[PDB]
């Protein structure tokens, strides 16, 4: 009954964690790329 | 605006209304047995 | 640690316990009919 | 190829077959009461 | 009964909106980064 | 009964495929951007 509500709560909370995992992974890469771009623009300037 | 809770108050309502439907049928059956028990009463 | 399976063993338990509840009520009804059939027996 | 609809035609089938199972048991009970009502008939 | 189908439809439509939100957020950043990279390559060239 | 478990398994497996689709799409873009940044840093250097 409530064991329903949690088994749904879990299945969904795992699917979103996986989502976060790939995302956080991506944003980290973009953050490092932006860092490099900043320096590139700074250098030529 | 809906969370898991909401989902489990739908599933709880469903099951309730489904128990309601069957206890209702059992009640009508019990009603029939009661009348039969009165006739048997008035026979013994 | 839960997969879809888990979800369908909750839904299966729910439905079971709900069949259990109604067969139980039917059994008590059948019990009542049995006593009435004995009185009728002892009347015929 | 499945959407929410699909999910709610499974849940609707489940509940149906579960109502079918209990009305069936009620019917057999009603059947028993009918025979008892005939014996009582043939006693009064 | 149908109130089931919607409560599932919603819980899922919220989880995907959150997904879109982070994504659209990310693609926007990449789009601006590509813009800068284009200019960097154009300049040195 | 099991037809439940699959209809849930599917609805969820589609929502994650869509997720992957956008992601794989994004990572590919970042991978090409990193490639260009590498070359930009290599050139000025």
From Swiss-Prot, chains B, C, D:
Disulfide bonds: none annotated. It is found in: Nucleus. GO terms for cellular component: axon cytoplasm; cytosol; nucleoplasm; nucleus. GO terms for biological process: axonal transport of mitochondrion; cellular heat acclimation; endodermal cell differentiation; muscle contraction; negative regulation of transcription by RNA polymerase II. Keywords: Nucleus. GO terms for molecular function: identical protein binding; transcription corepressor activity. The keyword Chloroplast does not apply. Negative regulator of the heat shock response. Negatively affects HSF1 DNA-binding activity. May have a role in the suppression of the activation of the stress response during the aging process. Belongs to the HSBP1 family. Homohexamer. Associates with heptad repeats of HSF1 trimers and probably also HSF1 monomers, and with HSP70. Association with HSF1 trimers and HSP70 coincides with attenuation of heat shock response and the conversion of HSF1 trimer to monomer. This is Heat shock factor-binding protein 1. The gene is HSBP1. The chain holds residues 6 to 49 of 76 of the full protein.
């Amino acid at each position: 009954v409530q064991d329903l509500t949690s088994v749904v709560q879990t299945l969904l909370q795992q699917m979103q964690d996986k989502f976060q995992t790939i995302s956080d992974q991506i944003i980290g890469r973009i953050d490092d790329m932006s860092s490099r771009i900043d320096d590139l623009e700074k250098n030529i300037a």
